[PDB]
Write an enzyme that holds these catalytic residues in place. Structure first.
Site, short mmCIF file in Angstrom:
data_model
loop_
_atom_site.label_atom_id
_atom_site.label_comp_id
_atom_site.label_asym_id
_atom_site.label_seq_id
_atom_site.Cartn_x
_atom_site.Cartn_y
_atom_site.Cartn_z
N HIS A 155 0.83 -1.18 0.00
CA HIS A 155 0.00 0.00 0.00
C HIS A 155 0.87 1.24 0.00
O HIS A 155 1.78 1.40 0.82
CB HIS A 155 -0.91 -0.02 1.24
N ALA A 156 0.58 2.18 -0.90
CA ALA A 156 1.45 3.32 -1.11
C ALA A 156 1.50 4.20 0.12
O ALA A 156 0.47 4.50 0.72
CB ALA A 156 0.94 4.15 -2.27
N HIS A 203 0.05 12.08 -5.17
CA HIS A 203 -0.44 12.07 -3.79
C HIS A 203 0.72 11.85 -2.82
O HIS A 203 0.91 12.62 -1.87
CB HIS A 203 -1.49 10.99 -3.64
N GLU A 204 1.55 10.86 -3.08
CA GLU A 204 2.64 10.54 -2.18
C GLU A 204 3.71 11.63 -2.19
O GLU A 204 4.31 11.95 -1.15
CB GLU A 204 3.22 9.14 -2.49
N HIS A 255 2.96 14.40 0.18
CA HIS A 255 3.42 14.17 1.54
C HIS A 255 4.88 14.52 1.71
O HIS A 255 5.26 15.16 2.71
CB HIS A 255 3.23 12.71 1.93
N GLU A 263 -3.10 15.02 3.35
CA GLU A 263 -3.47 14.16 2.24
C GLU A 263 -3.78 14.94 0.96
O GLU A 263 -3.74 14.37 -0.13
CB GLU A 263 -4.72 13.36 2.62
N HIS A 278 -6.92 0.22 5.60
CA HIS A 278 -6.85 1.14 6.73
C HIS A 278 -7.45 0.58 7.99
O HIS A 278 -7.16 1.09 9.08
CB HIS A 278 -7.56 2.46 6.34
N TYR A 316 -9.43 11.51 4.37
CA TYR A 316 -9.56 11.45 2.91
C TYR A 316 -10.83 12.17 2.44
O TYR A 316 -10.82 12.76 1.34
CB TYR A 316 -9.49 10.02 2.41
#
Ligand SMILES: *[C@@H]1O[C@H](CO[C@@H]2O[C@@H](C)[C@@H](O)[C@@H](O)[C@@H]2O)[C@@H](O[C@@H]2O[C@H](CO)[C@@H](O[C@@H]3O[C@H](CO)[C@@H](O)[C@H](O[C@H]4O[C@H](CO)[C@@H](O)[C@H](O)[C@@H]4O)[C@@H]3O)[C@H](O)[C@H]2NC(C)=O)[C@H](O)[C@H]1NC(C)=O
Ligand SMILES: NCCCC[C@H](NC(=O)[C@@H](S)Cc1ccccc1)C(=O)N[C@@H](Cc1c[nH]c2ccccc12)C(=O)O
Ligand SMILES: *[C@@H]1O[C@H](CO)[C@@H](O)[C@H](O)[C@H]1NC(C)=O
Ligand SMILES: [Cl-]
Ligand SMILES: [Cl-]
Ligand SMILES: [Zn+2]
Length: 578
Positions: free
Chosen positions: A314-315, A344-345, A348, A372, A474, A484
């Site tokens: 999971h990323a 998305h990553e 972060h 996020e 999750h 989210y």
């Protein structure tokens, strides 16, 4: 005395950097190489970090925060008084850390096997089946199989997990773990605020749902789709029916305006996971934001290993709490969906780099939803026909109204479909944590909310022993979800504001902020605040006002709302379900 409090924060910051960096390394080594040995070391570092948290948290609790004058010192000390899991007695802390690791490991190594045939993992194999198969029974096999092998296997741990995380929450002054999690937003009105935002998205969701339901009726047959009922949960292109964009080909508004196969274009053009992350890095630096450091490219895990290692696919993005070492761990597949995840990553990582000089207690997003959102904002511009055409992934579209509605539909299948899913996950968990849902009715109440909010039904009746929430990452990983929902609302507010900062006029959905230094400066000023101030200040810096608001998302999708209403009215759809 103000002097003892200031000294305390300095000592906490110095020692936390060291301990958290060591814990992060052990957690990374487990996540990227699941073995008995890396598990043992991680559990040991869990006890080391708990010893530190207990030592400093016990001292922080001896300060009367009400008498501290400096607001930054007061804020840090108050937060350090929350020991999280380190509040548990030693025996229960050991048990809790073991349960968390066992749940994560179970989810990450689960497979679904054909009889005397091949065994499929979630990433990429089952994800690919859900995205591409158009056969009801094949989709059912994957959907049911994943729930039977992952979800059922989490159930044995979940009641004890709930007991222990709630016990820790009560020892930290909350009533239950859901109260603790909600508190991260520092917003006493949070539940009503979120409910109002969900209600404002109902016209768009209900209309999207009805239109998709009609298209599924055409493909899967009248005997399998009730035009006045919920949609079977295995037909939306995604294991969780959380985003629906993989069924675009079944629901194209204007089939006479065909669109390029972006996966085939990415594959034919030789895109790799590294190229996807390099593109994301370029978008950030085009806004005047920071490049990721050389170390990131050496240490990150940007694709699934080929050497037999079991990993957590999971990323996720990782801060090593030394201001230099930031990494992404993702089992990247070459397609547009994972190009968006890569952005998305990278958002972060950008946030980590922006707030790296704050005290570690303030090294978080303004709230978890801001963390996020950042990468998703840039991805809204990446996804535009203008940007995709520039990557050679789409043929020029010119301004055609047909191509425009097609584009809005592709975006809605991800962004609007996810609103009810992202709302419901923690509606369920908050009620588990508060005790109104017990192990007697975990799965029934999950399905009651899947129906109420998403208008979905399970294609096979559920049975005692099923634990379908356990089949969503999750849940066994104990990662809160309402972040989210918040992210998807506020990322449109941020797009609107950055588009205005960049001087764009005309429809919001046509905006591409690539290369806007004005847009980057707005984001950077907010991200530098980390968690030092309550989140309305960061909201104000980006958007010029302090509230969460669905108005930007509604403006983005207004042309599609109008098109869907006309189309559903023409076909006589009855919105909703019983
Ligand atoms: C309440 O306390 C906070 C925190 O104090 C800091 O932590 C304590 C634990 C203790 O160690 C303190 O000694 C320590 O300062 C105070 O917030 C800090 O305020 C100072 C002064 O404004 C900030 O210093 C700035 O740091 C930057 C990074 O190094 C630097 O770029 C800045 O320089 C820029 O701005 C100055 C003008 O201020 C300008 O002359 C420069 O040329 C340049 O543009 C500047 O030195 C800290 O960053 C702050 N730290 C945090 C975490 O916010 C706060 O001031 C205090 N409040 C009151 C009312 O006293
Ligand atoms: N195929 C999607 C992979 C997304 C990975 C993302 N990952 C984290 O947020 C990590 S950074 C957080 C974390 C994880 C583990 C441990 C600690 C922290 C995540 O979880 N998104 C949520 C919502 C979501 C679905 N699609 C998306 C596309 C773009 C943006 C968001 C989403 C989800 O996947 O359901
Ligand atoms: C995986 O973990 C094992 C056990 O700790 C170790 O011997 C091995 O070197 C690790 N491999 C990688 C690639 O980190
Ligand atoms: Cl489910
Ligand atoms: Cl959250
Ligand atoms: Zn994330």
């Amino acid at each position: 005395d103000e002097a003892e409090a200031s000294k305390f924060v300095e000592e906490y910051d110095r020692t936390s950097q060291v301990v958290w960096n060591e814990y992060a390394g052990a957690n990374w080594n487990y996540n990227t190489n699941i073995t008995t040995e890396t598990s043992k070391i991680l559990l040991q570092k869990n006890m080391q970090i708990a010893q530190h948290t207990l030592k400093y948290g016990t001292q922080a609790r001896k300060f009367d925060v009400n008498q501290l004058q400096n607001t930054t010192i007061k804020r840090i000390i108050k937060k350090v008084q929350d020991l999280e899991r380190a509040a548990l007695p030693a025996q229960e802390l050991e048990e809790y850390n073991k349960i968390l690791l066992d749940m994560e490991t179970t989810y990450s190594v689960a497979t679904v096997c054909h009889p005397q045939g091949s065994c499929l993992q979630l990433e990429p194999d089952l994800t690919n089946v859900m995205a591409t198969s158009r056969k009801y029974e094949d989709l059912l096999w994957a959907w049911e199989g994943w729930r039977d092998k992952a979800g059922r296997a989490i159930l044995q741990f979940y009641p004890k997990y709930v007991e222990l995380i709630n016990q820790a929450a009560r020892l930290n002054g909350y009533v239950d773990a859901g109260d603790s999690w909600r508190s991260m937003y520092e917003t006493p009105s949070l539940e009503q605020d979120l409910e109002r935002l969900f209600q404002e998205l109902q016209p768009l969701y209900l209309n999207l749902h009805a239109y998709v339901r009609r298209a599924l009726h055409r493909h899967y047959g009248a005997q399998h789709i009730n035009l006045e009922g919920p949609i079977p949960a295995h037909l939306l292109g995604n294991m969780w029916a959380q985003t629906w964009s993989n069924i675009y080909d079944l629901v194209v508004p204007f089939p006479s305006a065909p669109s390029m196969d972006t996966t085939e274009a990415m594959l034919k053009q030789g895109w790799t996971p590294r190229r996807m992350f390099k593109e994301a890095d370029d978008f950030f630096t085009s806004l005047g934001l920071l490049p990721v450091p050389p170390e990131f490219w050496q240490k990150s895990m940007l694709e699934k290993p080929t050497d037999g290692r079991e990993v957590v696919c999971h990323a996720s993005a990782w801060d090593f709490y030394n201001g230099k070492d930031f990494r992404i761990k993702q089992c990247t597949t070459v397609n547009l969906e994972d190009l968006v995840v890569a952005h998305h990553e990278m958002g972060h990582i950008q946030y980590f780099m922006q707030y790296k000089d704050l005290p570690v207690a303030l090294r978080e997003g303004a709230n978890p939803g801001f963390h996020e959102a950042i990468g998703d904002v840039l991805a809204l511009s990446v996804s535009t026909p203008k940007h995709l055409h520039s990557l050679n992934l789409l043929s020029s579209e010119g301004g055609s109204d047909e191509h425009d509605i097609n584009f809005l539909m592709k975006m809605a299948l991800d962004k609007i479909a996810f609103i009810p899913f992202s709302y419901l996950v923690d509606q369920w968990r908050w009620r588990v944590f508060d005790g109104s849902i017990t192990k007697e009715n975990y799965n029934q109440e999950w399905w009651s909310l899947r129906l109420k909010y998403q208008g979905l039904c399970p294609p096979v009746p559920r049975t005692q022993g099923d634990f379908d929430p356990g089949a969503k990452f999750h849940i066994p990983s104990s990662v809160p979800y309402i972040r989210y929902f918040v992210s998807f609302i506020i990322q449109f507010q941020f797009h609107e504001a950055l588009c205005q900062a960049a001087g764009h006029t005309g429809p919001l959905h046509k905006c591409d902020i690539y290369q806007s230094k004005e847009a980057g400066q707005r984001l950077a000023t907010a991200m530098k605040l980390g968690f030092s101030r309550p989140w309305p200040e960061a909201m104000q810096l980006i958007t010029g006002q302090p509230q969460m608001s669905a108005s930007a998302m509604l403006s983005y999708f207004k042309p599609l709302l109008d098109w869907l209403r006309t189309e559903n009215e023409l076909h006589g759809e009855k919105l909703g379900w019983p």
